[PDB]
């Protein structure tokens, strides 16, 4: 949302084991307003999965989503 | 609702009360969020944050979902 007073998604736990890469189609980082600096993997059924950018598998997943 | 799925949080409350007729539903943001909040879901599907302690917010929720 463009509205300051509207909700924004935040993460409070990171997924431990990597979700199948083929089931992920997009990603974005949660707002800097959130307490945790997470990445969100958007799945095939549009689930918003939180992950830790510092973890190697997460870093590679993000890179593999480059154009 | 896995612990690792995102959940909506509020960081600012709408100051001016939005048109009550524009509201179709409401819910409370997770206690995991830093701020307590009532979210009014509008007919445009916006998720508007409001302060639960405000009089209008209280009277709004007391008269919705009926």
Swiss-Prot record, chain B:
Outcome (variant: residue 7 to A): Reduced inhibition of activity by tick evasin-4
Top-level taxon: Eukaryota
Residues with glycosylation annotation: 3-4
Methionine sulfoxide PTM positions: 66
Sites marked Cleavage: 1-2
Cystine bridges: 9-33, 10-49
UniProt-recorded name of the protein: C-C motif chemokine 5
UniProt organism field: Homo sapiens
Gene of this entry: CCL5
Full-sequence portion shown in this chain: 25 to 90 of 91
